[PDB]
């Protein structure tokens, strides 16, 4: 296998992280396990400290005219890498044990355990004119050297190896999304059934979505157009809970349903980024600068847990709405993310 | 007494600071951010001050009369109100931007666009011209007082005299309204900043530094501009009651804000490094082979 080894500007610190992307199981998040190769002769007085900080960048500026930092550490853990502390001792994994053998005694292992119910690696799409670091949650194992944690972290000794906490699709398929909204107009005084539904709940990125819109308009009023919008709701709860909506795919069909008539159409849509790159504030998946960033994967939150979680929590729902001579609307939620890569 | 050195000092300060800020924002691609272009219009507005306004103003003050030109007197005056109104509105715009960022950072990303910010400063320059140039072209600011009419008729005389209506209208639309928006926006920013620091709580030192930064940028602006528009409000009610030498002294205290804006609003490390360079890394992620089991 291979191990990603990012080195510090000076070159003394080199963190050997086995993988830059860690599968996110809602039941038990995987550990960020690695070893830091340092020279025992160098920094004889200081102590190598590694920290896995989940910095949520809400502003695209490291510093501004006011001096306020525009990055909040939602989850920051500090473990003493060298010298090994008896209290911080952890059972070395197969990856860590193999790395220490290859590197030798000069290398010291470090392990982390990301608590569950945390935001995944999501990046707010910066516009084409935007200049600066992309916003969103990003995990990074900053390996620095300092006598204490509160001491200024010199960038020459730091190792900012940004990683991504990606969440793939579950092995079990979800229930068929189904939602029906009936609106009764005062003048018409008759129901307007909109029994739209999806073929499946788990959709792979780039896979077409088939919305079986089944309209049964019994009211005298007729629908002029059928607008299906795949609204991406980013539940950002950093300071104040706010659901930011961004349409990633809109289909406005000029299909009219005469009064006292039924309708049934399977609209095929596909959430893609090629057209949504102009959209500002869109939540994209958190990937490395080299790898291409796709649409943010739907965060699978723990059932029966806190509804508010700091960071970006994207949720996709197709909004099948019919405009009438007010308008009817119904939201069918669905989870959009990649499947677990098969390994053997 | 000599006015060349006293006037040259401030002149060199404004032109030097602004040229340095403009050069740092242009040459350096990292500084070409969204919040920086707001300061580029402030520095651009402050540059025209030290280039055309401050030099002509200093001469008229110590010489005693305006001998450059008859129409140039009104042109220089209109350009002065334009730059001041633009500088004040720019300080209020960036303040609103910091509020939109600190309070609603996620909405500020999509709401505040580079092209939109360019339109914002363009509208700022437009409203300032409507308050400065439009009255000058129509001579609406000219007062009907006897001393005022005498000064206007005399080509040499160029004292800034305005009627009660225009004086109040300009004072409320140019300084007081942006002032109320600025003080209110900064108060909300300070409250929200403390809440963010409390939620997060090296940590307290940065908080105190940010809180101190906010205070100095607001105190320097107030202490410089408030006295000028404060005495002007009384001068409008009683022109003869207020003195001319004090009106000029406070007007220069207001120009000091534009003179200190480049060094006060660019104190961030990104701007300090660019200034040091004008006055004069991240290692790629590799990989190694792990012995297979």
């Amino acid at each position, epitope marked *: 296998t*291979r191990v990603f080894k990012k080195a510090s500007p000076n070159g003394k610190l080199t963190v050997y992280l086995g993988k830059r992307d860690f599968v996110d199981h809602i039941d038990l998040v995987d550990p960020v396990d690695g070893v830091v190769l340092v020279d025992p002769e160098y920094l004889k007085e200081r102590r190598v400290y590694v920290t896995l900080t989940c910095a949520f960048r809400y502003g695209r500026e490291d510093c501004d005219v006011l001096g306020l930092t525009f990055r909040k550490d939602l989850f920051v853990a500090n473990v003493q890498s060298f010298p090994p502390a008896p209290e911080d001792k952890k059972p070395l994994t197969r990856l860590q044990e193999r790395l220490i053998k290859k590197l030798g005694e000069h290398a010291y292992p470090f392990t982390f355990e990301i608590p569950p119910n945390l935001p995944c690696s999501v990046t707010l799409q910066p516009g084409p004119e935007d200049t600066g670091k992309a916003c969103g949650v990003d995990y990074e194992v900053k390996a620095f050297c300092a006598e204490n944690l509160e001491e200024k972290i010199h960038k020459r000794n730091s190792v900012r190896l940004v990683i991504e906490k990606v969440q793939y699709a579950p092995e079990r398929p979800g229930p068929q999304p189904t939602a029906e909204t009936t609106r009764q107009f005062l003048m018409s005084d008759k129901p307007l059934h909109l029994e739209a539904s999806l073929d499946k709940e788990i959709y*792979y*990125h*780039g*896979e*077409p979505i088939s919305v079986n819109v089944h309209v049964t308009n019994n009211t005298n009023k007729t629908v002029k157009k059928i607008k299906i919008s795949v609204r991406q709701y980013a539940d950002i709860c950093l300071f104040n809970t706010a659901q930011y909506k961004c349409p990633v795919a809109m289909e406005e069909a000029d299909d009219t349903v005469a009064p006292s008539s039924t309708f049934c159409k399977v609209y095929t849509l*596909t959430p*893609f*980024l*090629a*057209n949504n*790159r102009e959209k500002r504030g869109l939540a994209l998946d958190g990937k490395l600068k080299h*790898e*291409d960033t*796709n649409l943010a994967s739907s965060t699978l939150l723990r059932e029966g847990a806190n509804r508010e979680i700091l960071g970006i929590i994207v949720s996709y729902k197709v909004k099948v709405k019919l405009v009438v001579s007010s308008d009817v609307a119904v939201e069918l939620p669905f989870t959009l993310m*990649h499947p677990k890569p*098969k*390994e*053997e | 007494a000599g006015c060349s050195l006293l006037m040259a000092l401030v002149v060199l300060l404004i032109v030097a600071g602004n040229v340095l800020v403009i050069a740092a924002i242009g040459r350096t691609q990292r500084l070409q951010t969204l919040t920086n272009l707001f300061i580029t219009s402030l520095a651009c507005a402050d540059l025209v001050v030290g280039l055309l306004v401050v030099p002509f103003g200093a001469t008229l003050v110590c010489r005693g009369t305006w001998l450059w030109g008859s129409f140039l007197c009104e042109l220089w005056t209109s350009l002065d109100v334009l730059c001041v109104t633009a500088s004040i509105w720019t300080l209020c715009v960036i303040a609103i931007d910091r509020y939109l960022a600190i309070t609603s950072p996620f909405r500020y990303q999509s709401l505040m666009t580079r092209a939109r910010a360019k339109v914002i400063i363009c509208t700022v320059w437009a409203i300032s011209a409507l308050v400065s140039f439009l009255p000058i072209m129509m001579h609406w600011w000219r007062d009907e007082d006897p001393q005022a009419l005498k000064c206007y008729q005399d080509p040499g005389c160029c004292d800034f005299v305005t009627n009660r209506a225009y004086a109040i209208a300009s004072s409320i639309i140019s300084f007081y309204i942006p002032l109320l928006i600025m003080i209110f926006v900064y108060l909300r920013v300070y409250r929200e900043a403390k809440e963010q620091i409390r939620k997060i709580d090296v940590m307290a030192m940065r908080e105190h530094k940010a809180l101190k930064t906010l205070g100095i940028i607001m105190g320097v602006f107030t202490l410089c501009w408030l006295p000028f528009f404060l005495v002007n409000i009384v001068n409008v009610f009683n022109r003869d009651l207020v003195p001319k030498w004090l009106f000029v002294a406070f007007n220069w205290l207001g120009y000091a804000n534009s003179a200190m804006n480049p060094i006060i609003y660019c104190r961030s490390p990104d701007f300090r490094k660019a200034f040091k360079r004008l006055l004069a890394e991240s290692a790629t992620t*590799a*990989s190694s*082979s792990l012995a297979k089991d």
Partner: antibody
Amino acid sequence: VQLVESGGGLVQPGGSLRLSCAASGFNVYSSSIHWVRQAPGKGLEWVASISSYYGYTYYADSVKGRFTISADTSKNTAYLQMNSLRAEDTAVYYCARSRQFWYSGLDYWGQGTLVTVSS
Amino acid sequence: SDIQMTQSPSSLSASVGDRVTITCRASQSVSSAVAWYQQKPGKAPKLLIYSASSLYSGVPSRFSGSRSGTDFTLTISSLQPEDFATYYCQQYKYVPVTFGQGTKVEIKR
């Protein structure tokens, strides 16, 4: 699961052609369509690729400019418009697919369409 | 620049039920993203191994991939009569992807 390409015929140098590639069993957004030409008695040479999910049009250094790759989403078809043809382009063009999330070789390959280029 | 993939041997001779090895060296330090394809005369190529270490679903298990830094290797434990075809190595890590020169494998007599 099946890629069928067509539109490859005899063309003279400097002519124009439109090579089509229809897909069946997979959409153009979830997988990027790639074009690789293999000249007779020579190895494979990547021509150009289209990523509908990203709208990225990648071309080879020697093939960039003269070629124009596009994709029709409604018909899940790929198109490779060819202009300023040269004798070197004589090869068996193959239309394959690559997993957009994420790139893992080229799973399915087309039968190929011999497009000879000679005066 | 273009990362040309030097593949060898240009022509490998082997017999049925024998072990063969095809080497492919990248000009630059390419990552594990190096696929291996099988091209038969006339027929279209076939993706044998992806990521240089993961066999594509539906291919025989005899094929195997092993990375030794920059010299990727495709090994066949026991090649059958159907395994007599050309082999190519492409580096889909950096664009433009560059294929290999080819390694024609024929029956040894």
